[PDB]
Amino acid sequence: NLVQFGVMIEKMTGKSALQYNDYGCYCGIGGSHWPVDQTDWCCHAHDCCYGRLEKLGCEPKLEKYLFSVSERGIFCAGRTTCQRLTCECDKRAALCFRRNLGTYNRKYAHYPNKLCTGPTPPC
Ligand SMILES: [Ca+2]
Ligand SMILES: [Ca+2]
Ligand SMILES: [Cl-]
Ligand SMILES: [Cl-]
Ligand SMILES: [Cl-]
Ligand SMILES: [Cl-]
Ligand SMILES: [Cl-]
Ligand SMILES: [Cl-]
Ligand SMILES: [Cl-]
Ligand SMILES: [Cl-]
Ligand SMILES: [Cl-]
């Protein structure tokens, strides 16, 4: 929110960070079962993105990066490749959040985890 991914979410969606860090079955810590909607699928993919970074030896949950937003889009930067990779995962997710604003549903914010059912899609 005052931190990097949160700041990117706010810039790209017009929403508060708090409206995406606990949404559906995947936005927020961990994730299981079937994503509730397209925005949730952005978070399923983002989780997979961090998994890939972790396997490369990065710590994406802790990496801090630099970025700007202009009209060509989101520009990523950071001293290290792991910082830039984390930015790239976040950028993809924030763009996915913006793309799917049309089906964002307030009822899925702070979704009770017990409501998550079905299989867990593979990465
Ligand atoms: Ca998650
Ligand atoms: Ca939720
Ligand atoms: Cl991704
Ligand atoms: Cl990879
Ligand atoms: Cl900026
Ligand atoms: Cl962009
Ligand atoms: Cl843009
Ligand atoms: Cl640094
Ligand atoms: Cl690195
Ligand atoms: Cl709504
Ligand atoms: Cl809203």
Author numbering: 1 to 123
Sentences copied from the publication:
Two are apo-hGIIE structures at the resolution of 2.0 Å and 1.9 Å, with different crystallization conditions: without (apo-hGIIE_1) or with calcium (apo-hGIIE_2). In the apo-hGIIE_2 structure, crystallized in the presence with 10 mM CaCl2, Ca1 with 100% occupancy is seven-coordinated, and two water molecules provide the extra two coordination. In the apo-hGIIE_2 structure, Ca2 is 39% occupied and coordinated by carbonyl oxygen of Gly24, Tyr111, three water molecules, and either the carbonyl or carboxyl oxygen of Asp22. Amide oxygen in the 3-side chain and one of the carboxyl oxygen in the 4-side chain of inhibitors are coordinated with calcium instead of water in the apo-hGIIE_2 structure. Similarly in apo-hGIIE structures, a water molecule, part of the second calcium hydration shell, forms a hydrogen bond to the carbonyl oxygen of Cys27 and links the second calcium to the oxyanion.
GIIE, the closest homolog to GIIA, is regarded as a “hair follicular”, “inflammatory” and “metabolic” sPLA2. The structure of hGIIE consists of a typical set of three major helices (α1, α3 and α4), two β-strands (β1 and β2), and three short helices (α2, α5 and α6) around the second calcium binding site.
